[PDB]
From a paper:
Connexin family proteins assemble into hexameric channels called hemichannels/connexons, which function as transmembrane channels or dock together to form gap junction intercellular channels (GJIChs). Human Cx31.3/GJC3, which is expressed in oligodendrocytes of the central nervous systems, does not form intercellular channels. We determined the cryo–electron microscopy structures of human connexin 31.3 (Cx31.3)/GJC3 hemichannels in the presence and absence of calcium ions and with a hearing-loss mutation R15G at 2.3-, 2.5-, and 2.6-Å resolutions, respectively. We also found that the hemichannel has a pore with a diameter of ~8 Å and selectively transports chloride ions.
While the overall structure did not change with Ca2+ ions, we found small but substantial changes in map densities in a deep tunnel at the interprotomer interface around the acidic band. In the structure with Ca2+ ions, although we could not distinguish Ca2+ densities from water densities due to large overlaps of Ca2+ and water positions, we could observe substantial changes in map densities in and around the Ca2+-binding tunnel. First, the density blobs corresponding to W1 to W4 are considerably smeared, indicating that the water-mediated interaction network is disturbed by Ca2+ ions. In the hemichannel structure with Ca2+ ions, we have not observed close coordination by more than one residue but found many putative binding sites, especially in the Ca2+-binding tunnel. This suggests that Ca2+ ions may play its inhibitory role via multiple weak interactions with functionally important acidic residues, including E47, D66, and E187. Although Ca2+ ions may not strongly bind to E47 and E187 in the tunnel, the dynamic interaction between these residues and Ca2+ ions in the tunnel could disturb the interprotomer interactions, including water-mediated ionic interaction between E47 and R184 and the salt bridge between E187 and R75. In addition, the interaction of D66 with R171 appeared to be weakened by Ca2 binding. The Cx31.3 hemichannel structure in the presence of Ca2+ ions also showed no conformational change, except for several side-chain conformations, compared with its Ca2+-free structure. This suggests that the permeant selectivity could be changed by extracellular Ca2+ ions through the positive electrostatic barrier mechanism, which is proposed on the basis of the Ca2+-bound Cx26 GJICh structure. Ca2+ binding seems to be not strong enough to drive a large conformational change of hemichannel or GJICh at least in detergent environments, and an additional factor, possibly lipids, may be required for the complete channel closing by Ca2+ binding.
Author numbering:
A (entry chain A), B (entry chain F), C (entry chain E), D (entry chain D), E (entry chain C), F (entry chain B): 2 to 107, 127 to 221
The structure:
Amino acid sequence: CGRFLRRLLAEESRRSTPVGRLLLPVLLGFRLVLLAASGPGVYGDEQSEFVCHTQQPGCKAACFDAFHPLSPLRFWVFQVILVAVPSALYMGFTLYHVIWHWELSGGAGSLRLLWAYVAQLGARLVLEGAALGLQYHLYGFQMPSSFACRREPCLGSITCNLSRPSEKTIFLKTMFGVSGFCLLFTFLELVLLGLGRWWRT
Amino acid sequence: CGRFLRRLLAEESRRSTPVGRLLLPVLLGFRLVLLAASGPGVYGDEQSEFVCHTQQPGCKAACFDAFHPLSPLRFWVFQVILVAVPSALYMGFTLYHVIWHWELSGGAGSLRLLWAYVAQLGARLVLEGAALGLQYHLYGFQMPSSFACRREPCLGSITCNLSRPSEKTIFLKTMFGVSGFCLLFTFLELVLLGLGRWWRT
Amino acid sequence: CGRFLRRLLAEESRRSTPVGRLLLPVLLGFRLVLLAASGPGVYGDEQSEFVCHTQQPGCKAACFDAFHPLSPLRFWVFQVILVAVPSALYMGFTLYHVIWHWELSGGAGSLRLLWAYVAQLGARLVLEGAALGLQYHLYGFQMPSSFACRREPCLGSITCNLSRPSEKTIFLKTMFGVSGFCLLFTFLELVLLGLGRWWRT
Amino acid sequence: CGRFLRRLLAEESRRSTPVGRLLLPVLLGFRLVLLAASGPGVYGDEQSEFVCHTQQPGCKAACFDAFHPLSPLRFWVFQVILVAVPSALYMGFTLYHVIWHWELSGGAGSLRLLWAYVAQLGARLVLEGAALGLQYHLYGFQMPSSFACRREPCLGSITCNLSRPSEKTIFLKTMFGVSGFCLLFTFLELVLLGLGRWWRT
Amino acid sequence: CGRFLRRLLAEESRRSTPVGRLLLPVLLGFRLVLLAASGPGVYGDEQSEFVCHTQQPGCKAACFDAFHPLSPLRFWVFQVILVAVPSALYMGFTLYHVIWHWELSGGAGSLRLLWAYVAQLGARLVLEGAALGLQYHLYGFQMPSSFACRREPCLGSITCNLSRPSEKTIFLKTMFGVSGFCLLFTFLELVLLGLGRWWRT
Amino acid sequence: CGRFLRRLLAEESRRSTPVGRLLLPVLLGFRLVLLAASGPGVYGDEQSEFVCHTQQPGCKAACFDAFHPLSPLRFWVFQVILVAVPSALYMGFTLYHVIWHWELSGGAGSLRLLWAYVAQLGARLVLEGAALGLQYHLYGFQMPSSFACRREPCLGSITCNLSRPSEKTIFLKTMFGVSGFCLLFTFLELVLLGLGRWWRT
Ligand SMILES: CCCCCCCCCCC(CCCCCCCCCC)(CO[C@H]1O[C@@H](CO)[C@H](O[C@@H]2O[C@@H](CO)[C@H](O)[C@@H](O)[C@@H]2O)[C@@H](O)[C@@H]1O)CO[C@H]1O[C@@H](CO)[C@H](O[C@@H]2O[C@@H](CO)[C@H](O)[C@@H](O)[C@@H]2O)[C@@H](O)[C@H]1O
Ligand SMILES: CCCCCCCCCCC(CCCCCCCCCC)(CO[C@H]1O[C@@H](CO)[C@H](O[C@@H]2O[C@@H](CO)[C@H](O)[C@@H](O)[C@@H]2O)[C@@H](O)[C@@H]1O)CO[C@H]1O[C@@H](CO)[C@H](O[C@@H]2O[C@@H](CO)[C@H](O)[C@@H](O)[C@@H]2O)[C@@H](O)[C@H]1O
Ligand SMILES: CCCCCCCCCCC(CCCCCCCCCC)(CO[C@H]1O[C@@H](CO)[C@H](O[C@@H]2O[C@@H](CO)[C@H](O)[C@@H](O)[C@@H]2O)[C@@H](O)[C@@H]1O)CO[C@H]1O[C@@H](CO)[C@H](O[C@@H]2O[C@@H](CO)[C@H](O)[C@@H](O)[C@@H]2O)[C@@H](O)[C@H]1O
Ligand SMILES: CCCCCCCCCCC(CCCCCCCCCC)(CO[C@H]1O[C@@H](CO)[C@H](O[C@@H]2O[C@@H](CO)[C@H](O)[C@@H](O)[C@@H]2O)[C@@H](O)[C@@H]1O)CO[C@H]1O[C@@H](CO)[C@H](O[C@@H]2O[C@@H](CO)[C@H](O)[C@@H](O)[C@@H]2O)[C@@H](O)[C@H]1O
Ligand SMILES: CCCCCCCCCCC(CCCCCCCCCC)(CO[C@H]1O[C@@H](CO)[C@H](O[C@@H]2O[C@@H](CO)[C@H](O)[C@@H](O)[C@@H]2O)[C@@H](O)[C@@H]1O)CO[C@H]1O[C@@H](CO)[C@H](O[C@@H]2O[C@@H](CO)[C@H](O)[C@@H](O)[C@@H]2O)[C@@H](O)[C@H]1O
Ligand SMILES: CCCCCCCCCCC(CCCCCCCCCC)(CO[C@H]1O[C@@H](CO)[C@H](O[C@@H]2O[C@@H](CO)[C@H](O)[C@@H](O)[C@@H]2O)[C@@H](O)[C@@H]1O)CO[C@H]1O[C@@H](CO)[C@H](O[C@@H]2O[C@@H](CO)[C@H](O)[C@@H](O)[C@@H]2O)[C@@H](O)[C@H]1O
Ligand SMILES: [Ca+2]
Ligand SMILES: [Ca+2]
Ligand SMILES: [Ca+2]
Ligand SMILES: [Ca+2]
Ligand SMILES: [Ca+2]
Ligand SMILES: [Ca+2]
C-alpha cells in the first residue's frame, strides 16, 4: 500500500540532514550510472589495446600481467557493492522495525535506530577512504603511453604501447573526484550530528 | 496509491508555465532516446574506422589519440546525467515536502519551493551553456575526411582517412540543435517568471 | 488507481472517431515493432556488404560515403520519434487538465482540448508527408546490385557490388506502404471532423 | 483495479467456446516463444553458411540473392505481427465498450461485439491460409545441401554448398505444423458458432 | 486485487499433495534457469569446435550434419515448452472457473477440476517419458573426442576432433538426472491420488 | 495487497535472529551480483587465453580438456542455484500456510514451521560445506602461468601458457572467502537456536 511507504521513508530520514537525505544518494547513483554506461567503452578492450613488439611465445602475457594485476572495471565494481552493504543492512533493520511496531499501535525503540545510522556512516567513511588510497596506490593519476618490461620468458627489454591514454586518464580523474566528494559529505554529515563535540568529551 | 501521485504532480507543477510543464521534458527525453538508439551505430566503431597509411609500430595509436582525446559518445553521456542532477534534487526536495505536510493537515512553506525551482533552472542554464561551448571547441560543426599527423614515434608526416564523414556530420549538427533549443526554452521559462524585471531592480 | 485511468482514456478519446481511436495506434505500433525486430537484420551490416574492386587507400570509404550519406535505419528512427512528439504533448496536456479539474468537482474548458487534437493531427500530416517525399528522394523504390564511383582519391572508374538487394528492396517497399497508410488515415480523420466544410467557408 | 479486469475478461470471452478461450492463445504464444528462442540459432548465420567454389568478384552475392530473396526469419516475423492485428483491434474495441457502459449502469449493444468476433476470426483464417501457401511456394518442405547457379557476373555453372540442412529442415517442418493447427482450430471455432448452417441458408 | 489471487492459488492447489504443490514447480524452474544461464556457454559454439583434417570443399559440412542433425540446445528448448503446454491450459481453465463463479456467490463444478488435474499429469508423464528415451537415442550418455566420417563429397575416411568433451558430458548427465526426477515425482503424485487402486478395479 | 505481505514477512522471520534475518540474505545477494557483473569478464574467454606451442592436430584440445574439465563459471552457477533450492521450498511452505489460516481466523500449527526452518539451514550447511571442499579439490588457491601436458595425440611434452593469472587468482580467493562467511553464519544461526544443547542431550 501507499501509507506504509510514507512511513518507511519518514522513519528512515527522521534523524538525517539534507546532506544525507538528498545529496549523498544522488552522488552515489550518479557514479553507478556513469560506470555502467561509459566504463566498458573506455576499458573493455584493454587486452587488445596492449601491443608489445616481440615474437617470443609467452612474453606478451607476462608483461601485461605485470602492468595490470587488476583491471579498473573490476576494482570499481567491488567498491560500489561494498559501500552498498552497510546501507542494505540499515534499510532492512528499519523495515522490520516498522512491521513489528505497526502490530501494537496501529524513544528507547526510536533511539536504537540512531546508533544504526551513525554506525553505517562510520563504516562507509572507512570503506570510502581505504578505496581512494588503494586506487591511488594501484593506478595513480595518469595512464602512460609506453611500458618497459623485464621478466621471464622475455629475453631482454621489451617495449609495449598502449591505446587511448588521454581518454583513460580523463575517466580515471573523474572517478577519483566523484568518490572524493562522496567521502567529504559522509564526513560532513557526521559533524552535523555532533561528532565535533563527541570526540572532545 | 493514486491520490498521492496526483498531489506530487500538482505541487511540482504549480509555479511553472506550459513551457516548463510540457515542452522541456519532451525535448530532454527526445535527446536521450535518440542517443541510445542511434549513437552507437554512428560512432561505436570509431577506432576501426581510422586508417593510417604506415607501418611503424605505435604510430597509429599516437595519431588517433591526438585527433580525439574524448569520443562524442562519452561527452554526450556526461552532459545528459549532469543536467539531470539539478532536477533529481528538486524532485526529491518536493517528495519529502509532501510526505511531512500530509502528516499535519491530512505560503512560507510553499514559497521555499519557488526558490528551489528558480535555482535548478539557473544551474541548468549554466550547465547547458558551458556544454554547447565545449562541444563547439572540441569537435566544431564538421568532421573531416582526412587528417595530417606529426608526432612521435611517427617518422615524417602521416595521412589518415576516416569513414562515414557525412553521417557523422549530420548527427553532430542534429545534437547541437536539440541542445540549443533546450537552452532557449530554459531561458524563456525564467523570463516568464519575472527575470526581466528582477535584473532591472 | 483504476478510476483515474478510466477518466484519462475517456477524455482523450471523446472527440475522435474509430479511425483515430483504434486504427492509427495499431498502425504506428506495427511499424515500430517491425523496425525493431527485422531492421538490424536487413541493414545492420551495410558497410561490410559493400565490396569495391580496388586497392588504392581511401577509395572504398569515399565511394560508400557518396552512395549513402544516411543509412535507412537512422532515417526511420528519426521519423518515428518526430511523429511521436505531437502525441506526447497532447497526452501531457490532457493529463494535467484532468488532475486540476478533479480538485474542483470531485464546454469552455472541454473545447480547448478539441483545438489541441486538431493541431497535433495537422502537425502529423505535415511530418508524415515530408518524410515520405524525403524517403523517395533519398532511396527511391529499388536498391541496385552495382554502383559506379568517380571521386577522389580513386583513380578512374571503380565498380562496387552490393549484397542482398532483393531483401532490401522488399523491406523498403513495405515501409513506404505502412507509412503511406498512416498518412491516409490521418487525413481521413480530419475530414470526418469537418475539414471538408472548414476549407470551404 | 481488479474488478475492472474481471469484467474485461468475462466480456471478451462470453461468446467463444473452449477452443478459442484456451487452445488458440496457447498455440499462438507457443509459436512466438519458439521463434524467439531457437530461430536466430538455426537461421541467423545463413550468409556465412553459404560457400561457393569460385573467385570471380560479385558471383557469390548474385547466387545467394537468387537462392533466398527473403529469409525465413523475416517471413515468420511478418506473419506473427499481421495475425495479431485483427486481435489487437478487437481487444481495443472491447476496452472502450466497457469503459463507456460502466458510466451509465455502474442486447443491441452486446450484439455488435459478436459481429466483431466473427470478423477477426474470418480475417485470421484468410491471413493464416495465405501465409501457409506462400511458405510452401517459397521454401517447400526440404532445404537442399547443394545449389547450382547460372547468372551474371558468374562465368559458367557454379556449385554452392550449404551448412546444417537437416536442422533447418526440422525447424521448417515444425513451423508448418504449428501454423497448420492454428488454421484448423480457427476454422473449427467458426463451425461451432454456426458457420455450417449460415452458408446453407 | 489481493483477495482474488488468494482464491486462485487456493483453488489450484486444493486437490494436490506437497509433492505437486512445492517440489515439482521448484524442479521445473531449476531446469529452466540452468539451461538459460549455462547452456549457451557449453554448447553455443559447437560448429567452430568441430575440426576436420581435410581440404576438400563441402566435406566438413557433410560430416558435421551426420554427427548432429539436432543440437542439444534446440532439443531442450522444445522439451521445456511442450511440458509447459498442459500446465498453461489447466491454469487458464482454473482462471475462468473462478471468474464466473465469483459472479453468482460473491461439488459437480468442483469435480470437473479434478479430472483436469489428473489429465495434465498424465500428459506430462507421457511427454517426459518420450523425451528421455529420445534423448538417450540421439546423444547417449557420453560425448566422444573423435569421429570417423565416410560420406560424399569426402574422398576416403576423414577424422574429426571435438573440443571440451568432459564438460559436455557433465552437462548432459546433469540434465538426464533433473529430468529423471521430474518423471519420478509426476508418477508419485498420481499414485498418491489413487492410481494404485484405479488400475486394479 | 499490502497487509498480506506484512504477514508473510512477519511469519517467515518470527523464529530467526538478526544473523539470519539481515546478514545472510545480504551475503548471498552480494555473491550473486558479483558473479553476474564481473565473472564473464575474468573467465569468459578462457579457451582463447590458452596457448600451446605446437602444430599437431588435436593436441591443443586434448591438453585444455585435461587442465579444466569444468569451468569455474559453470561450477559457481550450479552452487548458487542448489543453495537456493532449500530456501524456495521453505518460502513456498510458508506462503500456503498463511493462505489457508487466513480463511479460518481472518502452536501445533506454528511449530511445524520451526522444524522446516531448522531443516533448510541444515541442508544449506551440508551443501555449502561440500561445495567449498570440491572447489579446493578442483582449482586450489592459485592459477598457474604454465602447464605441462603429456597425452594422446600429442607427441612428447607440450608446454602451454595462460593469460591473466593474477586477476584470476584474486577472483578465486574472493569467492572462497564470501562462501566461507556464508558457511560460518549458517552454523552460528543454528547454535543460537540451541544446537549446542541439542547435540548434548
Ligand atoms: C568556448 C571557450 C571554452 C574554453 C574551454 C577551455 C577548456 C580546455 C579543455 C581541455 C580538454 C577537455 C576534455 C573534456 C573533459 C570533460 C570532462 C567529462 C568527461 C566525461 C566523463 C581538451 O581540450 C583540448 O582539445 C584538443 C583537441 O585535440 C585541442 O587541440 C587543438 O585545438 C583544436 C581546436 O579545434 C584543434 O582542432 C586541434 O588540432 C589542436 O591540436 C586543444 O587545444 C584543447 O586544449 C582536455 O585536455 C587534454 O589535453 C591533452 C593534451 O596532451 C592531454 O593529454 C595528455 O598528454 C598526452 C601527451 O603527452 C599524453 O599522451 C596523455 O596521456 C595525456 O592525457 C589530456 O590529458 C587533456 O588534458
Ligand atoms: C520531394 C522534394 C524534397 C526536396 C528535398 C530537398 C532536401 C535536400 C536534402 C539534403 C541531404 C538530406 C540528409 C537528410 C537529413 C535528415 C536529418 C535527420 C537526421 C537523423 C538523426 C541529402 O540530399 C542529397 O542526397 C544525395 C544522395 O547521394 C543526392 O545525390 C544525388 O541525387 C540522388 C537522387 O537519387 C542520386 O541518386 C545521386 O546519385 C546523386 O548524386 C543529392 O542530390 C541530395 O542533395 C543532406 O545533403 C548532404 O550532402 C552532402 C554532399 O556532399 C554533404 O556532404 C559534405 O560534403 C562532403 C564532400 O566534400 C564531405 O565529405 C562531407 O563531410 C560533408 O558531409 C552532406 O553534409 C549533406 O549536406
Ligand atoms: C499457392 C500459390 C501462391 C502464389 C504466390 C504468388 C506470389 C509471388 C511472390 C513473389 C515474391 C514474394 C516475396 C514475399 C514478400 C512478402 C512481403 C512481406 C515482407 C516481410 C516484411 C517471391 O517469389 C519468387 O520466389 C522465387 C524464389 O527464388 C521463385 O523462384 C523460382 O521458383 C522457385 C519455386 O520453388 C524455385 O525454387 C526457384 O528455383 C525458381 O527460380 C519465383 O518463382 C517467385 O516468383 C517476390 O518476387 C521477387 O522476385 C525477384 C525476381 O528478380 C525480384 O528481384 C528483383 O530483380 C533482381 C534481378 O534483376 C534484382 O537484382 C533485385 O534487386 C530485384 O529485387 C524481387 O524484387 C521480388 O519481386
Ligand atoms: C527409445 C526408442 C525411441 C525410438 C525413436 C524413433 C524416432 C526416430 C527419430 C528420427 C530423427 C529425430 C529428430 C528429432 C526431432 C524432434 C522434433 C522437435 C524439433 C525441435 C524444434 C533423428 O534420428 C536419427 O538420428 C541419427 C543420429 O545421427 C541416428 O544415426 C544412427 O544412430 C545413432 C544412434 O546413436 C548412431 O550414433 C549414428 O552413428 C547412426 O548413424 C539415426 O539412427 C536416427 O534415425 C530425425 O531423422 C533425421 O534423419 C536424417 C537422415 O538423413 C534426415 O536427413 C535428411 O537426409 C539427409 C541426407 O540426404 C539430407 O542431407 C538432409 O537434408 C535431410 O534432413 C533428417 O531429415 C531426419 O529425418
Ligand atoms: C575434499 C574431498 C572431496 C573429494 C571429491 C571426490 C569427487 C571426485 C570429482 C570428479 C570430477 C567432478 C566434476 C564436478 C561435477 C559437479 C556437477 C555439477 C555440474 C554443473 C552443472 C572431477 O575430478 C577430477 O578432477 C581432475 C582435475 O583435472 C583431477 O585431476 C588430478 O588431480 C588434480 C588435483 O589438483 C590435479 O591438479 C590434476 O593435475 C590431476 O590430474 C582428478 O583427480 C579428479 O578426479 C569429474 O571427474 C571427471 O574425470 C574425467 C577423467 O577423465 C572424466 O573424463 C572422461 O574421460 C576422458 C578421457 O578418456 C574423456 O575424454 C572424457 O570425454 C570423459 O569425460 C570426466 O568425465 C569426469 O568423470
Ligand atoms: C595508501 C597505502 C595503501 C597500502 C596498500 C597495501 C596493499 C597491497 C596490495 C596488494 C595487491 C592488491 C590487489 C587489490 C585486491 C582488491 C580485492 C578486491 C578484488 C575485486 C573483486 C596489488 O599491489 C601491488 O600492485 C603492484 C602493481 O603492479 C605494485 O607494483 C609496483 O608498484 C607500483 C606502484 O605504482 C609500480 O607502478 C609498479 O611498477 C611496481 O612493480 C606492487 O607494489 C603492489 O604490491 C595484490 O598483490 C598482487 O601481487 C602480485 C605480485 O606477484 C601477485 O602475483 C602473484 O605472483 C605472480 C608472479 O609469480 C604470479 O604470476 C601470479 O599468479 C600471482 O598472482 C598477486 O597475486 C597479488 O598478490
Ligand atoms: Ca584518447
Ligand atoms: Ca556517410
Ligand atoms: Ca536477397
Ligand atoms: Ca544439421
Ligand atoms: Ca572440458
Ligand atoms: Ca592479471
